[PDB]
Amino acid sequence: PSPEIGQIVKIVKGRDRDQFSVIIKRVDDRFVYIADGDKRKVDRAKRKNMNHLKLIDHISPEVRHSFEETGKVTNGKLRFALKKFLEEHADLLKEGE
Numbered sequence: 001p002s003p004e005i006g007q008i009v010k011i012v013k014g015r016d017r018d019q020f021s022v023i024i025k026r027v028d029d030r031f032v033y034i035a036d037g038d039k040r041k042v043d044r045a046k047r048k049n050m051n052h053l054k055l056i057d058h059i060s061p062e063v064r065h066s067f068e069e070t071g072k073v074t075n076g077k078l079r080f081a082l083k084k085f086l087e088e089h090a091d092l093l094k095e096g097e
Contacts, residue, residue: 003032003055006063008085013052016040020056020085022063022078037078058085 003009007023016039024045025033034053035045060081066073086093 001055002029003050003053004059004064005067006060006081008056008058008060008082009034009053010056011048011052012054014046014048020082021053022060022081024063024067024073024078035075035078036082037075038082041075042073042078056085058088060084 003023003026005023005026009021009023011017011019011021011034016036019036019039021034021036021040023032024035024042027033027047030050031047032050032053033045033047034040035042040046063073063077063081066077
């Protein structure tokens with residue numbers, strides 16, 4: 001599948017390995033930029049090779065809308081997009097420490 005703006009990823013390799021993030025820009029199917037609005041704010045968005053990310057089947061239409069209409073997204077909107085993902089999977093994640 002082709003990485004999408006607003007799509008959740010799990011980071012496979014990098015500083016924030018094993019954390020969740022959001023794709024906010026796509027160069028192509030090989031390189032994207034990620035940010036989570038928290039550990040990595042939009043002003044520090046990071047170019048990633050897709051080999052170092054796992055695409056998750058969750059896409060935020062609100063993040064996509066913000067980019068489509070204005071070319072940017074707020075940190076808080078990214079945090080909320082990730083929160084909705086976490087809510088859906090809370091029972092999978094609740095034993096995390």
